[PDB]
Write a protein that binds this ligand. Sequence first.
Ligand SMILES: Nc1ncnc2c1ncn2[C@@H]1O[C@H](COP(=O)(O)OP(=O)(O)O)[C@@H](O)[C@H]1O
Ligand SMILES: Nc1ncnc2c1ncn2[C@@H]1O[C@H](COP(=O)(O)OP(=O)(O)O)[C@@H](O)[C@H]1O
Ligand SMILES: [Cl-]
Ligand SMILES: [Mg+2]
Ligand SMILES: [Mg+2]
Ligand SMILES: [Mg+2]
Lengths: 231, 232
Amino acid sequence: MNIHEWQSKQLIQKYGGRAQSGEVAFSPERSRDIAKKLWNQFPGCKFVVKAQVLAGGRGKGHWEHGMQGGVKLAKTPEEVYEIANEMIGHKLITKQTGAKGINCNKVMVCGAVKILKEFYLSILLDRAMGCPVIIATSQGGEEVAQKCPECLFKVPISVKNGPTNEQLVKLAKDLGLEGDLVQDCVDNVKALYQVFDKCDSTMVEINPLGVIETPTDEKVICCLDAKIAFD
Amino acid sequence: MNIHEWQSKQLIQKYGGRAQSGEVAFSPERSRDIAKKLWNQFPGCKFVVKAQVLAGGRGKGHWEHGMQGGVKLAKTPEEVYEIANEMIGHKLITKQTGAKGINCNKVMVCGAVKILKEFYLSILLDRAMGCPVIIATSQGGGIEEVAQKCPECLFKVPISVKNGPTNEQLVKLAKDLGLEGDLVQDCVDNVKALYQVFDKCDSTMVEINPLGVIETPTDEKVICCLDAKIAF
Ligand SMILES: Nc1ncnc2c1ncn2[C@@H]1O[C@H](COP(=O)(O)OP(=O)(O)O)[C@@H](O)[C@H]1O
Ligand SMILES: Nc1ncnc2c1ncn2[C@@H]1O[C@H](COP(=O)(O)OP(=O)(O)O)[C@@H](O)[C@H]1O
Ligand SMILES: [Cl-]
Ligand SMILES: [Mg+2]
Ligand SMILES: [Mg+2]
Ligand SMILES: [Mg+2]
C-alpha cells in the first residue's frame, strides 16, 4: 500500500524535510483558484499540474481521451483549469498501469521552479544485508545500476541507532554537493529516515530529489516527488 | 481618503493588472501560518513583511519600541512571526507621521522577489488641462525632487477621457522608460488596467511607487506593482 505524492510530501515536511507539497484540488475550478491566489505572492509564475494517482510514470503517460502526460506545465490559472479538467474524472495510462489505466479524481497544483540537479534517493529494508539502506545516485536513467554500478551509492544504516552525520556528509559529497547544500542535504536525509523509521514504512522513494532555486535564486534541496509504502 | 496597500493592489488585479497583493494577516500567528504554507509552493523562499498603515515612508521608519523599518525582509516563518509581533498592535514612525507615529493592526506577508528596475507612475486629475495625465519616470530619486532636478526625466502623457490611453501613447512611454521585448506590451497592458482603476473607481490619484520589473521564480521578467496608493 502507498500514499499519494502530496500526502507523502506533507509527511516529509512534518519531519523537517523540504518538499513541494503544493495544494491538492478535486476540481478544475479549485485548481484555477489555487493558481490564481498564488499569483498574489509570485506574480507571473508558471504552474505544474500533477495527477495524484497511485502509479508511476505519470509524466510519460497519456489520458484515455488523448491528452499526453500526467505532469503538465501551465502558464496561467486558466491553463491550469484546462489541464486539470482533462485529468480529474478521467483515466490515466502509464507504464506501471498497462492498458487498464487508473482513475483520477484529484490533482496537485504547484508553482514551477528552476531545477538545477535531479537525484534519486530511496530508503528500504534490505533483506540481503539485514538492515535499512539509503540508495542514491546523480544519474537520470535499476537501469543505472546495471550500466553504471559506480553511480549507485548504498549506505547501510545502524538498525539500532540510525544514520550518522559522517555517513550523510559523505553521501552528500558523493552526489556532488558542496557549500551550504551539504548540510542542507544532510538535514533532509535525516528527516526522510525519520519518516521511514517512525512511520514503519516499507519504502521512502524520492524520485527526483532535486537542487532547486528559490524565487531569489538561492539553491536548496527539495523533494519534487515522493512515494511512501506501508503494510 | 486613501486605502491600504493590499486593498489597492487587489483592485488593480481585478482590472487585469499584475500586483503583489501578498496576503493580509491580522495577527502574528496568522502571519507565520501564511509564510509556512507558502513554503509548500516555493520551498526555501524568503518573505517580506509590510506594515499596513495609512502613511508613507515605511521602509525608513522605525517603531516606538526600537525595531527599524515598516517593510522588513524575513528568512523563515518564525522570523515573520517575530517581525509581525512588533508591528501588529504597535506604533510606526516615519517622515510623514512625525513623532506621534501611526498605529498598525495588520501586515501584508509577501514572498521576496528579485527586483531589476523600479519605476514611478501616477495617474492624476489635471485641472489646468481638464483631463487625466500619466506621469512616470525611471529615476530612483521624492517624485517632486526628480521633477525639479531633472524635469526631462519625467514623462507627461495627457489622456483622452473618451478613448483612454492609446496604444501609441503607451508603447512610447514604455520605451521612454527603457523597456524592450515582451516588457513593452506587458507594460502597456498594465498601464491600461491602472487607468481603468482610475477611471471606473473615480479616483483622484493612482500612484505606483515603485512600478517594478521583477523576475518570476523561473526568471521570466514581468511588470509588477510593488506598491500602490489610491486616493478619493
Ligand atoms: N514544481 C516543478 N516545477 C518544474 N518541474 C517539476 C516540478 N515538479 C516536478 N517537475 C519535473 O517533472 C518531472 C515529472 O514529475 P514526477 O513527480 O517525477 O512524476 P513521475 O515520476 O510520475 O513522472 C520531474 O522529474 C521533474 O523533472
Ligand atoms: N516582494 C518584495 N520583495 C523584495 N523587495 C520588495 C518587495 N516589495 C517591496 N520591496 C521593496 O521594498 C521597498 C519598500 O516598500 P514599499 O511598498 O515601497 O513601501 P513604502 O514606499 O511606503 O516605504 C520597495 O521600494 C521595494 O524596493
Ligand atoms: Cl525546511
Ligand atoms: Mg517521479
Ligand atoms: Mg512605495
Ligand atoms: Mg532569478
